[PDB]
From a paper:
Escherichia coli YtfE is a di-iron protein of the widespread Repair of Iron Centers proteins (RIC) family that has the capacity to donate iron, which is a crucial component of the biogenesis of the ubiquitous family of iron-sulfur proteins. Bacterial RICs are composed by an N-terminal ScdA-like domain and a C-terminal domain that folds as a four-helix bundle where a histidine/carboxylate di-iron type center is inserted. In E. coli YtfE, the best studied RIC protein, the center is coordinated by H84, H129, H160, H204, and two μ-carboxylate bridges formed by E133 and E208. We show that YtfE establishes protein-protein interactions with the scaffold IscU, where the transient cluster is formed, and the cysteine desulfurase IscS.
Residue numbers in the entry: 2 to 220
């Protein structure tokens, strides 16, 4: 019956379900309202297998369940756990990609364009996180979340843009899989990319699937 539940709710209730969905390239973050059934069908996946994997994960509860946590605590968590980390992650990745694209320019597997797309993502996240921290999050903390349809819709649109950039970054890097000739810096950079993707999806998931709907509902 997991297939009839939304991707977002599964990711938020089952430990490491997020990483399972990442493995299947299912967008539980911006597309978290869609059922696992619909997502698995769009990708021609055996949904029974996925339900078995989720059942194994669900043997234990999620260590921290944010679905019912105070919105102020969710906001403060987002800022430290995700916003502050993205601010450090992206500059480092941009410099690594520049070095990789230069040093391995001749090699056929080099992820040409990676720096460009990381820079685009960094520019988007920088302004985006500033708008949330300076406009939307204070509004929610003040209790005006029920009036935030406009601002939230803008943020969710920017989340979609970030999702599109993540898709290009994954394609450019053969789904963040380095070639055999990959140097240490190359492999380390891909590990950092996967960490960024993991974090940004959980980050967007927490906003799209918990903070924003609960704020709009007046919680
Ligand atoms: Fe955010
Ligand atoms: Fe956001």
């Amino acid at each position: 019956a997991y297939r009839d539940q939304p991707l977002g709710e599964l990711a938020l209730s089952i430990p490491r379900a997020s990483a399972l969905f990442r493995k299947y390239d299912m967008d539980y973050a911006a597309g978290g309202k869609q059922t696992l059934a619909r997502a698995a069908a769009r990708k021609e996946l055996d949904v029974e297998v996925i339900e078995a994997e989720l059942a194994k994960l669900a043997e234990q509860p999620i260590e921290k369940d944010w679905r019912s946590a105070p919105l102020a605590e969710i906001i403060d968590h987002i800022i430290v756990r995700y916003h502050d980390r993205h601010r450090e992650q992206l500059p480092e990745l941009i410099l690594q990609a520049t070095k990789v694209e230069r040093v391995h320019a001749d090699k056929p597997s080099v992820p040409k364009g990676l720096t460009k797309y990381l820079t685009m993502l960094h520019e988007l996240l920088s302004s985006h996180m500033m708008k949330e921290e300076q406009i939307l999050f204070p509004m929610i903390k003040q209790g005006m979340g029920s009036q935030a349809m406009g601002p939230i819709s803008v943020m969710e649109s920017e989340h979609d843009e970030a999702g599109e950039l993540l898709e290009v970054i994954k394609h450019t890097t053969n789904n963040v899989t380095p070639p055999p000739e990959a140097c240490t810096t190359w492999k380390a950079m891909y590990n950092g990319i996967n960490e960024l993707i993991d974090d940004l999806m959980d980050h967007i998931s927490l906003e799209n699937n918990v903070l924003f709907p609960r704020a709009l509902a007046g919680e």
